[PDB]
Amino acid sequence: PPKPFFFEAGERAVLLLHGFTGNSADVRMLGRFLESKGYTCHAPIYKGHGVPPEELVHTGPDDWWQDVMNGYEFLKNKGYEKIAVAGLSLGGVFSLKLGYTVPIEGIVTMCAPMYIKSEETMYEGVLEYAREYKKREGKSEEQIEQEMEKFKQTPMKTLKALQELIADVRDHLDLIYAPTFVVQARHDEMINPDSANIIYNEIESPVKQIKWYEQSGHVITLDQEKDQLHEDIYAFLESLDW
Secondary structure, eight states: OOOOOOEEOOOOOOEEETTTOOTTTHHHHHHHHHHHTOOOEEEOOOTTTOOOOOTTTTOOOHHHHHHHHHHHHHHHHTOOOOOOEEETTTEEEEEEEHTTTTTOEEEEEEEESOOOOHHHOOOOOOOOOOOHHHHTTTTHHHHHHHHHHHHHSSSOTTTTHHHHHHHHHHHHHHGSSSSSSEEEETSSSSOTTTTHHHHHHHHOOOSSEEEEEOOOOGGGGGGGGGHHHHHHHHHHHHHOOO
């Protein structure tokens, strides 16, 4: 079972936020890299994540946002005065939201969506995540088929609220002034990659960058360009005033 992590290293702190159906392991290699460069990092786990998929469908963005805000306060309460945030997929949407809610030193958004899909299609992605989870538990083909039949007997009501969240943060991009680095996979199989241009062009931040990765998929932290990604994020964070 994944756990949140807290990697102590230096005075600069980074909150690391995972994606929908993800967990802290999606940002753990980035956390260890930043820790080796002097950055303290903390990654929460959202409610219903890092646990059986059956639990995910009774949670929604109102819950996950509380984990995000508690993760920010965690850092504050441990003595960190300045905090940057980096987020993957839905985590990048929450990074932006935190950026117009509380004091933030810098924002890194990685493959954050600014367009949505149908609720059916989003539930299809939850079903596929549940299948992979159960495959990974080492369940039999027959056992997985029985459990998935039953999983289907329960709607995930909060998918509309997740659509509303993305739309809402998009509409508030003009409130963002913190230095921001927009990261996007050119060929992203899960979201519209033009999302990155929406973020870059609509924030008000005088210090902004965007970088495209040509050989990566959506979960960019775990893909083949992660080492260059690490160095690019480090370079961005070292450029801030702190």
